[PDB]
Symmetry: C3
Subunit: 423 residues, 3 copies
């Protein structure tokens, strides 16, 4: 699995004993916590040395253990599949440590993990929620309506956040026009907004990429007109100070200006954007999460996200396709600060529109592409066979801050292209 269930234990002294102490999640600060797991789940346990004696963790029945960690902060992660139901001791095997208190239970329960009923609006943009290709057609005047909306959203299972959005979702509406078009932009800022909002389009030519004409008071509306002079895949974002603050809170999206021919036909298109959120409390903390200004200006986020939320493209709104389809992903980074090393595990990019150029010839046969903040690209590939394909930033520590996504494709396990055993 690429969604392991994760527990963090720090060694320490508590309740008059030498113990394991739970760190974050549902086990924060509990001593020798019960690790509750569902049958068939992959379990990851991170052991961190708290007080500076030698330690490990061992679960006899799964032939699983950490390495021995010796000094303060020394760490060892191990994993296994929870294949047998029942109750199992995790313990420290160092002389005396089990007797002295270093012992807890892993409970493997039958059936599938139930999802926590949500407490706030779903702010996640479905990756299929974009307009299809524009027909061949003359250049013309297009009216676009955006509303800036401030609202609490479901950031994770049991954690909320005050998002700022275009039309109550992250990313914002996928905008699709043809080069030469005249865009009539209307920006309504909701009555219940505390902040002024605006929009800079990277596909617009003139002051602030429209920001100078879109500074909108709450309950007010701006109207601006601009020509789409250049074909490309452009990120748009709020441009009201603090711009980094407006971007982290959710105010980014993509503007496709099709070239005259349109893009090469493909069977299926998807909308994906990466960003960071900068919270006071670390990744995995339950409750209302709040923004930490010191962490934002110092570029030290706690969440890395596809389309606004943890589980956005795994649990709530994943990608779906059929064997033999050509797939296109519009992938942009709102940021505000981090470059994505975009990759799909189990696939290779047939075409990569380098630096989001739609007019230059695409690069071919590419594993991984750098996309900067305030940049996008286009990738396509043919699905030659079935699987769960995984979208990642290949700076892979971002898996542990919520950045993973699923492309689900129905096919047999084994075939000519990849199979168990020899040829």
């Amino acid at each position: 699995s690429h969604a392991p269930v994760v527990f963090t234990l720090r060694t320490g002294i508590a309740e008059g004993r030498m113990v394991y102490i739970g760190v974050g999640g549902d086990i924060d600060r509990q001593v020798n916590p019960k690790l509750v797991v569902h049958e068939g789940e992959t379990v990851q346990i991170n052991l961190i040395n708290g007080e500076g004696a030698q330690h490990d963790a061992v679960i006899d029945q799964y032939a699983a253990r950490s390495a021995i960690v010796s000094g303060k902060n020394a760490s060892s992660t191990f994993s296994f599949i929870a294949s047998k139901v029942g109750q199992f001791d995790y313990y420290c095997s160092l002389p005396g440590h089990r007797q002295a208190g270093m012992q807890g239970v892993l409970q493997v329960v039958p059936g599938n993990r139930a999802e926590m009923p949500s407490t706030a609006a779903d702010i996640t943009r479905d990756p299929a929620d974009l307009p299809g290709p524009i027909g061949a057609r003359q250049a013309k005047t297009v009216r676009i309506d955006l509303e800036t909306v401030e609202l609490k959203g479901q950031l994770d299972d049991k954690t909320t956040y005050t998002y700022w959005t275009f039309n109550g979702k992250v990313p914002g509406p996928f905008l699709r026009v043809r080069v030469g078009d005249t865009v009539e932009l209307h920006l309504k800022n909701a009555k219940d907004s505390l902040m002024i909002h605006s929009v800079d389009f990277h596909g617009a030519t003139g002051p602030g990429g429209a920001a100078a004409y879109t500074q909108t008071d709450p309950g007010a509306e701006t109207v601006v007109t601009f020509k789409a002079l250049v074909p490309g895949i452009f990120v748009y974002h709020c441009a009201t100070p603090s711009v980094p603050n407006h971007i982290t809170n959710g105010m980014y999206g993509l503007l496709l200006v099709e070239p005259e021919g349109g893009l090469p036909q493909v069977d299926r298109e998807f909308y994906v954007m990466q960003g960071e959120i900068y919270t006071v409390k670390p990744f995995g903390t339950s409750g209302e999460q709040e923004m930490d200004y010191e962490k934002l200006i110092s570029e030290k986020p706690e969440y890395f996200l596809f389309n606004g939320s943890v589980g956005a493209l795994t649990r709530t709104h994943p990608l779906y396709a059929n064997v033999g389809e050509t797939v296109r992903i519009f992938f942009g980074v709102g940021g505000p600060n981090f470059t994505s090393s975009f990759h799909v595990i189990g696939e290779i990019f047939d075409h990569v529109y380098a630096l989001g150029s739609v007019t230059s010839p695409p690069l071919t046969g590419v594993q991984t592409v750098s996309v900067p903040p305030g940049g996008a690209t286009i990738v396509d590939f043919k699905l030659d066979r079935g699987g769960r394909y995984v979208l990642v930033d290949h700076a892979l520590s971002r898996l542990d801050h919520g950045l993973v996504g699923f492309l689900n494709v129905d096919g047999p396990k084994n075939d000519a292209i990849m199979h168990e055993g020899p040829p």
Copy 2:
């Protein structure tokens, strides 16, 4: 304005009251500070929860307010245009907090902010200070003279730093030759230098890119000859240990090696380089700033700068051009550590010379290009209309460490490419 006046407030207990406390700038550690602002200026207020009670900041006559912030370190920023002259109360709206002492005054003064008289040397290279296109001509021997100079310089309004430079400015002189040219380089280390200085040209072939031949004692001169074998836009930099130290202090420049044809004809060329400075005290602290080794080797800078200084390309040496003109920016990253997401707000790159290749086809219709430390690129675009165009690193938290520049182009606010109402 894309240069808002920024104030940071931490809530706390001080002078026997529950108060706002100034953080950085002119208001550092003052309780309930007076925020002084000039008519028309954009004002940004950063509120940070200090002691852990619920707080906001409210200014009534501007219908401006932070969000409510609950736990320690929780934060909200808000902004507005200081369109109204006089004195206005900023205060906390939570039951009792204003009575308990959470109140200060915003003073809006008529007229424009006067410039601070400078303590130290202007070390900013004018972006228009470069030699123009070489004619067509035969390859030949070219003499180049560099001087390595240690001098105190104006990092910011009230703040100085010890710069290490090529010829007293940052970046160093723009060197321009043709492929085939034999370069006769004279490097003179000034008598009053403490340090050995040198140079490595990324456009030279041989040991240390000339560094092995140019290790120059203070008060001495070395001479080195090298052939420009490959066309490109190259960074040069000091190559005396510690090389990161000599770079952060400002010893970086660009060398253009023109291809046979020369580069395409353009109306106007500009010289811009990005670097970092690693100071003991945070961004905005007045006085002599000093270098912090721990922050240098761990890649934690306080300043992100175009051409040496805060306000380099906004206040003291901004960029000027006329509507209808095609513009080329030679953009390099001295670094020493951070990759730039280079972008011009309100413009699109007609051409981007990928990884600084002068011989491969440029990519077309690009919003944003990654440039690594020790790398450079060329961008160009036609100025279809007038406005303030803004050079940024689209890692936009670097806005709050000094990274912003202006390209000023005279023209009407409203026109066919972007305008106020509908069509």
Copy 3:
């Protein structure tokens, strides 16, 4: 030299006197430590102000000195060539400070520094250790054997670390097949492994890029068959959770799928991968280094390495080539988290295979290329002349965490391409 001997001194109060205190390496916590150096070494001294009085460091016989550091954490670094054998005082020139105790000895000893005798296995891959170009030949079944081995490795001179590897070295085996080939992969997990291991190939099509078929218990074997459908230079890595943990401990390599025509003829090929290691104690600490989870998940490493170790490509297994040879470097980033700015000091890349595409035309005349984690590229250049050419990540603070390599080429100092003095 581009590998200086480095000493850090913090000023403070110890043993009843105002003194210098050693930081890190052989001098950690020693007062006025003896700085022992071999004749001809380049010496870098980092002064850090500890207690807040004014300090410098002066060595009279070498005309060498720091600048004056005033505030706590204020830093100045200086360098010189230890050209003179004997004992030289380093001392603070501020009034009284020398008399108050700020004085130590620099000892310069004749002859070269002996290498320290290792304690653990050599785990660095020789950059020359790769199979050469495959003939022209028909597509066929190729069998590959990989063994996952956990073992202590010589990380630095007197520091060790528990590495996880493919076949006992970092990077893993260079895999070379022809496009159209069928790969029969055998992965054996050694009996003495604590952990499950696996492999994902970025050049395989299907679930986990083979990870879904290769989750192998200790003392077990897995077998998977897959078709090489795309030509490219692909990273492969372990894909057992924690994937970031498995990668940082050393489980990455390169798979070249040759195109039918082969890569261009070249005189000499090399294998180089860049990674990070996240240790509890800082770079330079002797003894057993252990893994720091908190540093891994927050992207804050202590070691930046080519091919597994400090000195990997300078002392133990450097690169050798001859003047006039065309050279190819296959360069990959295992990571797990940092984008490399790959540069060879003294050279310029004739060709850069952008995003590791082997089917799109290579870019020409490039100084420096961004390679993401889980990305790879090919550079080639002609060696016109002799020198030590230096492999670096141009994020040059990484010089101070172990990231440097040597390409040694026998030839004269002075020729027509680069010489001392004028024409």
